[PDB]
Amino acid sequence: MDIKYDVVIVGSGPIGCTYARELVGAGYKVAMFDIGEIDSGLKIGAHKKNTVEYQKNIDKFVNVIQGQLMSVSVPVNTLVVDTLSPTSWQASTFFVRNGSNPEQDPLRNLSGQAVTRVVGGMSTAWGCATPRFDREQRPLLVKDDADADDAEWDRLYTKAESYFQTGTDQFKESIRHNLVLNKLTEEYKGQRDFQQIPLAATRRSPTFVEWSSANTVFDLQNRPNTDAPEERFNLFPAVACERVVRNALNSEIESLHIHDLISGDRFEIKADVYVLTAGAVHNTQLLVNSGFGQLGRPNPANPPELLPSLGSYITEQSLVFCQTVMSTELIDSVKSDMTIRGTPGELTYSVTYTPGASTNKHPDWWNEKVKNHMMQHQEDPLPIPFEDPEPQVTTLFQPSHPWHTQIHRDAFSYGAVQQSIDSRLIVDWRFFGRTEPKEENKLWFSDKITDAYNMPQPTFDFRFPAGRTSKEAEDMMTDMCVMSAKIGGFLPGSLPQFMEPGLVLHLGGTHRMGFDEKEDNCCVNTDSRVFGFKNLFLGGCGNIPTAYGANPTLTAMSLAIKSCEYIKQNFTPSPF
Amino acid sequence: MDIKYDVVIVGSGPIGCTYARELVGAGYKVAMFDIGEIDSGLKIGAHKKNTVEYQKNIDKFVNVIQGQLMSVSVPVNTLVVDTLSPTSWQASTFFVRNGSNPEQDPLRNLSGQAVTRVVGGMSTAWGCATPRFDREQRPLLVKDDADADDAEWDRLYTKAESYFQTGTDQFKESIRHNLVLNKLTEEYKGQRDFQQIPLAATRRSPTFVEWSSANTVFDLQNRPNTDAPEERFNLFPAVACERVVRNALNSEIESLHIHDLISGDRFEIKADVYVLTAGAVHNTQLLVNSGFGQLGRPNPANPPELLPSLGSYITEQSLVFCQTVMSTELIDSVKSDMTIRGTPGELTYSVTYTPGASTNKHPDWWNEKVKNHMMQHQEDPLPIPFEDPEPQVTTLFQPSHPWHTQIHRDAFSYGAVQQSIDSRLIVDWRFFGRTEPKEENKLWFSDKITDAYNMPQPTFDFRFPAGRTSKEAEDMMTDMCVMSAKIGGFLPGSLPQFMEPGLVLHLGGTHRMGFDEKEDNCCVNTDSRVFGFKNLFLGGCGNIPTAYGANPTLTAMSLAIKSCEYIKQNFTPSPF
Amino acid sequence: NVIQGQLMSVSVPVNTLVVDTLSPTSWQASTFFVRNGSNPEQDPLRNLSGQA
Amino acid sequence: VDWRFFGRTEPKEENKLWFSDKITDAYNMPQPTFDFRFPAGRTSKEAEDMMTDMCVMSAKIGGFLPGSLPQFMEPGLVLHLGGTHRMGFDEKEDNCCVNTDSRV
Ligand SMILES: Cc1cc2nc3c(=O)[nH]c(=O)nc-3n(C[C@H](O)[C@H](O)[C@H](O)COP(=O)(O)OP(=O)(O)OC[C@H]3O[C@@H](n4cnc5c(N)ncnc54)[C@H](O)[C@@H]3O)c2cc1C
Numbered sequence A, B: 001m002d003i004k005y006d007v008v009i010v011g012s013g014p015i016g017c018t019y020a021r022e023l024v025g026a027g028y029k030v031a032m033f034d035i036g037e038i039d040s041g042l043k044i045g046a047h048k049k050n051t052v053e054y055q056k057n058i059d060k061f062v063n064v065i066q067g068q069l070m071s072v073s074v075p076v077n078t079l080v081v082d083t084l085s086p087t088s089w090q091a092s093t094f095f096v097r098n099g100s101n102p103e104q105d106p107l108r109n110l111s112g113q114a115v116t117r118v119v120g121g122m123s124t125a126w127g128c129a130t131p132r133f134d135r136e137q138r139p140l141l142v143k144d145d146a147d148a149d150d151a152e153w154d155r156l157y158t159k160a161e162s163y164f165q166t167g168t169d170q171f172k173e174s175i176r177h178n179l180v181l182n183k184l185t186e187e188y189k190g191q192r193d194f195q196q197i198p199l200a201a202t203r204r205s206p207t208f209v210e211w212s213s214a215n216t217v218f219d220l221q222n223r224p225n226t227d228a229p230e231e232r233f234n235l236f237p238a239v240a241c242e243r244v245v246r247n248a249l250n251s252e253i254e255s256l257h258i259h260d261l262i263s264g265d266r267f268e269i270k271a272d273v274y275v276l277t278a279g280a281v282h283n284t285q286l287l288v289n290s291g292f293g294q295l296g297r298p299n300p301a302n303p304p305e306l307l308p309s310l311g312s313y314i315t316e317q318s319l320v321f322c323q324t325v326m327s328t329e330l331i332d333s334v335k336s337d338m339t340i341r342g343t344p345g346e347l348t349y350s351v352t353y354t355p356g357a358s359t360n361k362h363p364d365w366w367n368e369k370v371k372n373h374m375m376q377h378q379e380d381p382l383p384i385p386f387e388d389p390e391p392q393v394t395t396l397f398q399p400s401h402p403w404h405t406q407i408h409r410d411a412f413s414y415g416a417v418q419q420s421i422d423s424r425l426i427v428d429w430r431f432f433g434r435t436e437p438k439e440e441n442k443l444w445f446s447d448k449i450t451d452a453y454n455m456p457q458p459t460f461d462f463r464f465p466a467g468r469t470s471k472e473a474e475d476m477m478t479d480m481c482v483m484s485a486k487i488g489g490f491l492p493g494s495l496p497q498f499m500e501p502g503l504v505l506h507l508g509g510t511h512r513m514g515f516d517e518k519e520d521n522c523c524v525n526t527d528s529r530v531f532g533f534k535n536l537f538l539g540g541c542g543n544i545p546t547a548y549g550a551n552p553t554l555t556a557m558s559l560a561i562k563s564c565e566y567i568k569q570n571f572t573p574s575p576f
Numbered sequence C: 001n002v003i004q005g006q007l008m009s010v011s012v013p014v015n016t017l018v019v020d021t022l023s024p025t026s027w028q029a030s031t032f033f034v035r036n037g038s039n040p041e042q043d044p045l046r047n048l049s050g051q052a
Numbered sequence D: 001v002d003w004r005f006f007g008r009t010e011p012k013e014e015n016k017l018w019f020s021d022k023i024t025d026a027y028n029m030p031q032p033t034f035d036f037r038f039p040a041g042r043t044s045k046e047a048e049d050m051m052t053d054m055c056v057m058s059a060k061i062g063g064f065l066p067g068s069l070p071q072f073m074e075p076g077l078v079l080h081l082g083g084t085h086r087m088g089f090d091e092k093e094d095n096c097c098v099n100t101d102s103r104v
């Protein structure tokens, strides 16, 4: 570890890695620090689902996810346990136990919010859905010229899509996928369009998908190396970044204070450029611990000196979920084109179809799989092949249905494998609402309570705003109930519900971007530069200042590509 | 990849790494194949609990464990779900669904048995408890000379302890450990002795333990390399080993058939020596797929040609568990030496003690930690420091209490997170019973159903034997109830219970060792050589033929070391 | 069930269970107010909660 | 087979049933409020020793039924409350409310 770099990046998630890819490639001497460790295979920061064992047992991946999601703010527990033995030590109050946060109102929390501290960040376990935002959901990068703003976002997204290897055809030959897609296309003919979820992923075989991650964006290997002999990059895992040191004039960051967790020593790292990409919660924490914003419980009677909008206007999406069990009609329709002789298990059994018959409701690739499955597993009562890939269907946010949707199967933290119903029958429904930014919705940090790394304890004061946000959330629930019934009935134990606030992990606006600090109530400009500071940049979903329903990471990455363009224009790499 | 090795080893768990450590060091050309992949970071095969993040959030590690444990044999599900929507598809039977095993009687199963497929095997997640077996539990290595047998086991276990870095001091300054240790010592004075659980682990700091694993035994780096230029080792992950090929006379193994899961290629690998260390289930599966034992439902009207005892005489330990909440008397005793004046939280409050006072119940180090906690955290009502390490207590198996005990905290698959009671108050109790080997207790493999890697499906036919095994398992439950009461009452939600059969993952006897194939109803001799075969060796808990209660891995390691001695005496390494 | 049906709890403390999955349109509490027959005088940790 | 072991509780002045002067019950009478903990000392020692006795004695008949593992029941679920208008010989010396004729 040197004491001096051209650029230091805090965090090795996909956004930090976007800065690394751009700046390392442009010849800067770059260090990256992560509080977490390489724990993840030979490919550093790669998706943990990309193992043979996980792709043969996807349900087990829910456990991996649970294992690395650490709750941000847990209120003081008030559960009454009054069946302890009379000899056991017994509480007289609900005192602060087990890491809980006494600052946290349990009724104004994002109790589902959590963070991951591992190299690659949450991209080691994420779902890889990377849709673009439409105008309605997106902040402006160019004022008073929509066509120009659109062109700039098209340019940025196109590059972000290449970095993540986003595509919309990796599930094109799944029967379950096309079954669901075709039925919904028909049911909403001329009202709503359906397509594959845009996924950051590359299909490697009919049973293996290489899901993208941070590693895809930047492989995190130290440079120079054989493959990049003129590049300079070092990743330092197990290092907690604690503070950026401001100059007295509040115009420049002068150093980064770090704590090496393995040795316990502290150090002061110098760079020309500092990029904070620690996630939406921890970028905010690091800033507040550095003198930006206001530490402690918000107190308006006292103006903060710097970035007064920091931690305000936070947004988290409403998320409604259910699972369904595919209708008899749709299952029957899978074999609609089959000719069925004799009985299963018997010499007489025969299942056939004619490749290319124009009377066929399905393509040949489909009928061939159905025929083969039905003939090779005559004990099985379903027409869907065992290895058929999962559905991955969406109808993207529109003004007339202002929510994002995913009609799919994937692992999340609130997964629950159930074993009783055949898994080929099951489809997950997740609709995601947009949340209006309001000043009163805040992430703040205690001036007395600290977290497990001795940093100020994050506290939320959040409610979903009344008015459009609330009305839309409920309309979204009803839309999921109505749309899902086209495919099948609810699965018992996964009935339609709102999910715990924050479980969706789409938190935005904690360090929000705009054109003018005061007018747009914001913290960073459109180059992701912290107002007033020459050399401090923030990346991530914390920058997004709007109400959005779609998954935000692609949009964060795009902002980050725009930020690196500024940096390249304004700082000169040191001599190699 | 080469065509030809001196030694090939199937599996990279700690038993295969024992073979590697011995045989790479003695100059053999060694290849090792594992069906799983590297996924503990840069130290290949290391303990996954060795991150800062897990040691600050140990309960989250239960999810890691659950994530990698795959159930061996799941019977067909017969749960009634009768509240599906009428439009949803439903079969008319409980058909074979979701990977279940139609061979398996649900009432004669080890439903908790599970396997892990990752480089380092189960040692990437294990508890690291490495006790020695006393004579009562231990197979004989020398018959008719008990002191010769004693000396041989002492020499082997001492070696094994060195490989695993086993010690009994890593928790010596934990207040919770010493509170429990001291109380149990005093209460059973004259009857039972207590000590620290022997742990394969090295303390790095007061808040971090480096838990041992396969990596500690052998670092699994390919050789030659700078640190080992005269050594020859290749590790090949993501390779399923499927069969060893017998010569016509059943006197030698001729090759090993493997399937590379990434390329799909299949190869026959040749070696002078073949060592199988794939675990107690998968060793057995590989052998039965290679024409040892009997494939299919056991059929006594049809003696197998080879290894008649293979998969019979299986033993799994009964496991009883509870958690307790520390007694008010014990908690008050933590502070017995303190003089406490004033009211907590006021500037008049003080906690002091008299250093060195002959009448102090605790040592100065303890009282200092108590004092510092109470003064620095006046809002907290307990005297136990927040980062105090967990208890790690045992009274080892003896004839008058013929069960192993762990009185501790650690992460297992059945962990259940608890939030209303302070974790400092909670102690886990796990008592482990020994199970008599009976011929009727079997692991067999389907001749029609295959598993996810297309190998014969494991099936259990198991019940705990009546007579001594069942009597002792109940006496053990009572013992836990009696002993645990000395410390505190049970924690609601963790009441005293038997655990699902096999969840303890201490399965033995599947390929058991003995002196004489026929008289001792066994598969390998005391060199772990398969009877009849000059060049085939099995390692692991499958070899253990006795009824044991303590954790088996150190003993299996000691057997592997002995095996390696035989290999050194009988096979010459190839010129390097 | 007959027994359950005729045993009426003597003192039930104010309920502090967190329900944070209501729809945003539903009316919700800013406090754990006295609800559903509960007894605001009762310390939940010094009760005979099964008395009826 | 069901096993129920019932412990005795030392009468302590601080263990009280009292009635609110503002909150009322469903029949518009003063609402009952408890202030109770099992006394430290003999009551608590006996209660734990009583749990241990049930575990030891039950094991002679059979092992526990899953889902009915040994536990303490919620305080008061036993409905054996006493001492709320206690008897004795002398109102002051025996801290009581009725004499041995049950007369107030
Ligand atoms: C199960 C799952 C499903 C999701 N699915 C999707 C989806 O389909 N589409 C999508 O767009 N989003 C999804 N997300 C969210 C997505 O993963 C995140 O938006 C994304 O990873 C954010 O990237 P980032 O680089 O800003 O932050 P993170 O990925 O959170 O990385 C931040 C990093 O910084 C580190 N760090 C934190 N504090 C410090 C400090 N003080 N010092 C040093 N390092 C620090 C961390 O250890 C971490 O590695 C999902 C996430 C989860 C967990």
Ligand SMILES: Cc1cc2nc3c(=O)[nH]c(=O)nc-3n(C[C@H](O)[C@H](O)[C@H](O)COP(=O)(O)OP(=O)(O)OC[C@H]3O[C@@H](n4cnc5c(N)ncnc54)[C@H](O)[C@@H]3O)c2cc1C
Pocket: B010, B011, B012, B013, B014, B015, B016, B033, B034, B035, B036, B065, B116, B117, B118, B119, B120, B121, B122, B123, B125, B126, B127, B128, B129, B130, B239, B240, B241, B242, B277, B278, B279, B280, B282, B286, B411, B412, B413, B505, B539, B540, B541, B551, B552, B553, B554
């Ligand atoms: C949570 C938990 C706690 C435990 N606690 C303890 C404890 O405290 N003390 C203790 O003694 N024991 C404990 N154990 C058990 C201990 O981990 C095992 O006894 C030990 O790991 C066995 O070592 P092994 O090398 O024989 O087998 P394994 O560790 O199972 O390794 C066998 C390996 O072979 C591989 N393999 C399997 N099939 C094939 C194939 N066909 N081809 C190629 N490779 C294959 C696997 O991928 C695997 O890595 C615990 C286990 C767990 C999971």
